[PDB]
Amino acid sequence: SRLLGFDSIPAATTDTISLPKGYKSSVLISWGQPLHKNGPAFDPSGNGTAAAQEVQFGDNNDGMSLFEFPGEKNRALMAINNEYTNYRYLYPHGGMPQSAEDVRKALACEGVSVIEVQRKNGQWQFVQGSRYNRRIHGNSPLRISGPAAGHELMKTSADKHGKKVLGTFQNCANGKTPWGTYLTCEENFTDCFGSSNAQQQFDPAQKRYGVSAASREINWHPFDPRFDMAKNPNELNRHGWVVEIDPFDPQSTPVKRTALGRFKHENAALAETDDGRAVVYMGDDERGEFIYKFVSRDKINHRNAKANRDILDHGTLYVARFDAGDGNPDHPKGQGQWIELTHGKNGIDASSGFADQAEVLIHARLAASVVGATRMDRPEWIVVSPKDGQVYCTLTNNAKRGEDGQPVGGPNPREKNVYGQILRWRTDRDDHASKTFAWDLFVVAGNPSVHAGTPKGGSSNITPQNMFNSPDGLGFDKAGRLWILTDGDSSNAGDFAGMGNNQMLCADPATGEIRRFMVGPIGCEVTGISFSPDQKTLFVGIQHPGENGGSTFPEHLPNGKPRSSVMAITREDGGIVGAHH
Ligand SMILES: Nc1ncnc2c1ncn2[C@@H]1O[C@H](COP(=O)(O)OP(=O)(O)CP(=O)(O)O)[C@@H](O)[C@H]1O
Ligand SMILES: [Ca+2]
Ligand SMILES: [Ca+2]
Ligand SMILES: [Ca+2]
Ligand SMILES: [Cl-]
Ligand SMILES: [Cl-]
Ligand SMILES: [Li+]
């Protein structure tokens, strides 16, 4: 291959970072790092306060973007998501929150960490004390904008006007706009809500989004009533959005962009129509949910960044339908289309339960079911090639594929899918404004050591050497290499025998060739990817090392506490990461 400059590494089970010959890794920043001058040191005992956590790097770092600093090649800003927390390590008691301060501490872990990084002797390092350093967390004051701002469904007793919301949490992955802003995506936000009424009767929209009275083992609602559906049911509507942040303005108020719809947002991939309007491809990460596309009303003003202030408030939301494909067992190919989610179109009207467009966006999942969107195997990250504009989407797995309502077909070709696949599409005429596209399965993950000669063995670009499961994250570099990050079963046993710990692989989109590049430590997932502008440093996140108690990464102190970290990968020779030596 022209693009793959390293040899595929073996799978690993060690509590370390494994890389190819000639590569090195360094910890850029870890959960708990104070961001400001004289800030509170990380306390490995768990006794750190919620107020200190609000000024420290958040937990479980996930999607991230790097922004070049105008006029200074040795500076950059990074906006890094903090998705959730690990109660076994957050609290001294190691269990569920026991107080309002414990709840505040968990909310402080989540959100976004904006940091400055500087280079000295080729090595990028965190700059504690930079004026750009900032935490945006679960209790931060945010604004709501777009078509659902101010709607009755967005009003609560604490916010009677439906335009001011506390926090962004469950921040999964990201987007980077061409107007210098950062998009952060609220994914499993519903897990945080419960009810003080164990017999609460949830309405169809609440049930579709998966809320329950017990919460999904988060248990904030007994201490903070904002999360108690018996008292503040509309608070559920004020989360599950894409949030826009300006990393260069530390006093700016982040904005929830309701025009992009409400669902369990994984990431937000940017592209542009041939007539210059912004496009945002978005996955809803839940078994049997959909893939969405937002197209702005107005043209992007590339040379006047602030003229795009509210470009994401006006536009059109679509959802995908994919056909059955050609039935190819290895490389199925087909067509699909984008179906508009607008009140008064495609059967979305009062006869199907939608009074206005705000309700269509707040309950986008329901409107998408009305129009006949294709139920997918858990869409996670979406990326757009900078070389040819083709779009790539992980479909991480779907243990329920084949049950009633989720038939096997087209881009979801296997029942009880434990491995996942990567879906690709090419917008017609290579114009992102097109309502139709051609699709193919770029890779169908599998285990040819266990299941050779069967669908569970994967596609022919999968071998026992490079095999992996549950692709989640994706990233392109400027050369056109496609980086694949995994969040799968790390047991290295049964269906996952020989896959080892979670990992990162590199692929050539034009040939389908995939090589394993990095293996992460015990209990982690590999998530978050960004490159330095010169492409000589690849930044990648190690999330929840030791989720089940088997790691001390990265400090490796005796009976130590593992910490999610952002790693800086470089070549010892100083060349471009992934390229030939
Ligand atoms: N109690 C429960 N009921 C229903 N769905 C659940 C569940 N616990 C987890 N899930 C969902 O099942 C899927 C698999 O769970 P898991 O925690 O393994 O996923 P994950 O690590 O992929 C989450 P993420 O998408 O943030 O990376 C996810 O989509 C998760 O949201
Ligand atoms: Ca993910
Ligand atoms: Ca995942
Ligand atoms: Ca995960
Ligand atoms: Cl179709
Ligand atoms: Cl573990
Ligand atoms: Li253009």
Within 8 A by CB and 6+ apart from 344, the residues are none
Index of the ligand 1 atom closest to the CA of residue 380 = 25
Q: Is the CB of 172 under 6 A from ligand 1?
A: yes
Q: Angle at the Cα of 172 (from 322 to 64), degrees rounded to 5? A: 105
Burial 126-148 (b: 16+ CB within 10 A, else e): bbbebebbbbbbbbbebebbbbb
Instruction: Say how far apart CA 292 and CA 436 lie, in whole Å.
Output: 13
Asked if 551 contacts 520 with a C-beta cutoff of 8 angstroms, the reply is: no
Asked if 221 contacts 235 with a C-beta cutoff of 8 angstroms, the reply is: no
Ligand 6 centroid to residue 169 C-alpha, Å = 24
Q: Cα 127 vs. chain centroid, distance in angstroms?
A: 25
Instruction: Say how far apart CA 155 and CA 161 lie, in whole Å.
Output: 6
Residue 52's H or E segment, with its range, is: helix 50-53
The ligand with the least distance to the CA atom of 489 is 1
Method for this entry = X-ray
Ligand 6 centroid to residue 15 C-alpha, Å = 9
Q: Is the CB of 188 under 6 A from ligand 1?
A: yes
Cβ count within 10 A of residue 46: 15
Within 8 A by CB and 6+ apart from 345, the residues are none
Q: Locate 470 and state its tokens.
A: 């549950």
Determine whether 203 is exposed, middle or buried from the number of CB atoms within 10 Å of its CB (0-12, 13-18, 19+).
Answer: exposed
Within 8 A by CB and 6+ apart from 487, the residues are 380, 396, 470, 472, 473, 502, 525, 526, 527
Asked if 568 contacts 537 with a C-beta cutoff of 8 angstroms, the reply is: yes
Instruction: Say how far apart CA 307 and CA 553 lie, in whole Å.
Output: 44
Half-sphere exposure of 10 (CA within 13 A, CB side): 5
Atom 9 of ligand 1, residue of closest alpha carbon: 216
Instruction: Say how far apart CA 50 and CA 238 lie, in whole Å.
Output: 23
Instruction: Say how far apart CA 121 and CA 226 lie, in whole Å.
Output: 48
> What residues pack around ion ligand 2 (CB closer than 5 A)?
380, 472
Of 84, 285, 472, best ligand 1 pocket probe by most atoms within 8 Å of the beta carbon: 285
Phi, psi torsion values for 87, nearest 5 degrees? -60, -30
Instruction: Say how far apart CA 489 and CA 36 lie, in whole Å.
Output: 37
Instruction: Say how far apart CA 527 and CA 531 lie, in whole Å.
Output: 13
Q: Locate 73 and state its tokens.
A: 């090649």
Within 8 A by CB and 6+ apart from 285, the residues are 172, 187, 188, 264, 265, 266, 378, 379, 380, 396
Ligand 6 centroid to residue 413 C-alpha, Å = 31
- If we measure between CA atoms, which residue out of 419, 484, 422, 487 comes closest to residue 454? 419
Phi, psi torsion values for 120, nearest 5 degrees? -145, 120
The reported resolution of this PDB entry, expressed in Å, is 1.5
Atom 3 of ligand 1, residue of closest alpha carbon: 216
Instruction: Say how far apart CA 381 and CA 84 lie, in whole Å.
Output: 18
Half-sphere exposure of 246 (CA within 13 A, CB side): 14
Q: Does residue 329 have a cis bond before it (omega within 30 degrees)?
A: no
Q: Is the CB of 400 under 6 A from ligand 1?
A: no
Cβ count within 10 A of residue 202: 17
Is 513 annotated as ligand-binding?
A: no
Instruction: Say how far apart CA 20 and CA 337 lie, in whole Å.
Output: 41
Q: Cα 459 vs. chain centroid, distance in angstroms?
A: 25
Is 380 annotated as ligand-binding?
A: yes
Dihedral angle, C-alpha 75, 126, 81, 425, nearest 10 °: 50
Instruction: Say how far apart CA 293 and CA 340 lie, in whole Å.
Output: 9
Residue 278's H or E segment, with its range, is: strand 277-284
With tokens 């990460």, the residue in question is 285
Index of the ligand 1 atom closest to the CA of residue 172 = 26
With tokens 């090639």, the residue in question is 385
Half-sphere exposure of 40 (CA within 13 A, CB side): 16
The ligand with the least distance to the CA atom of 373 is 5
Q: Is the CB of 472 under 6 A from ligand 1?
A: yes
Determine whether 493 is exposed, middle or buried from the number of CB atoms within 10 Å of its CB (0-12, 13-18, 19+).
Answer: exposed
Dihedral angle, C-alpha 145, 190, 173, 262, nearest 10 °: -40
Determine whether 108 is exposed, middle or buried from the number of CB atoms within 10 Å of its CB (0-12, 13-18, 19+).
Answer: buried
Pairing of strands 171-176, 111-120: unpaired
- If we measure between CA atoms, which residue out of 440, 451, 461, 442 comes closest to residue 327? 440
Atom 13 of ligand 1, residue of closest alpha carbon: 286
- For 420, left (φ over 0), alpha (ψ -120 to 50), or beta? left
Collapsing DSSP to helix, strand or coil, 136 comes out as strand
Q: At residue 353, what is the residue type?
A: G
Is 59 annotated as ligand-binding?
A: no
Cβ count within 10 A of residue 559: 5
- If we measure between CA atoms, which residue out of 395, 383, 282, 259 comes closest to residue 338? 282
- Locate all alpha helices (DSSP H) within 423-512, ordered by sequence: none
Atom 4 of ligand 1, residue of closest alpha carbon: 210
Residue 289's H or E segment, with its range, is: strand 287-289
Is 102 annotated as ligand-binding?
A: no
Beta strands in 343-411 (DSSP E): 376-377, 379-384, 391-395
Ligand 3 centroid to residue 472 C-alpha, Å = 5
Length of the chain measured in residues = 581
Q: Locate 569 and state its tokens.
A: 């990968």
Residue 502: DSSP 8-state: -
Instruction: Say how far apart CA 347 and CA 332 lie, in whole Å.
Output: 31
Atom 2 of ligand 1, residue of closest alpha carbon: 216
Residue 207's H or E segment, with its range, is: helix 204-208
Instruction: Say how far apart CA 457 and CA 449 lie, in whole Å.
Output: 8
Largest CA distance in the chain: 65
Q: Is the CB of 286 under 6 A from ligand 1?
A: yes
> What residues pack around ion ligand 6 (CB closer than 5 A)?
522-523, 546, 548, 550
Instruction: Say how far apart CA 457 and CA 63 lie, in whole Å.
Output: 30
Q: Is the CB of 487 under 6 A from ligand 1?
A: yes
Within 8 A by CB and 6+ apart from 386, the residues are 476, 478, 480
Is 110 annotated as ligand-binding?
A: no
Atom 29 of ligand 1, residue of closest alpha carbon: 286
Instruction: Say how far apart CA 349 and CA 360 lie, in whole Å.
Output: 9
Atom 26 of ligand 1, residue of closest alpha carbon: 172
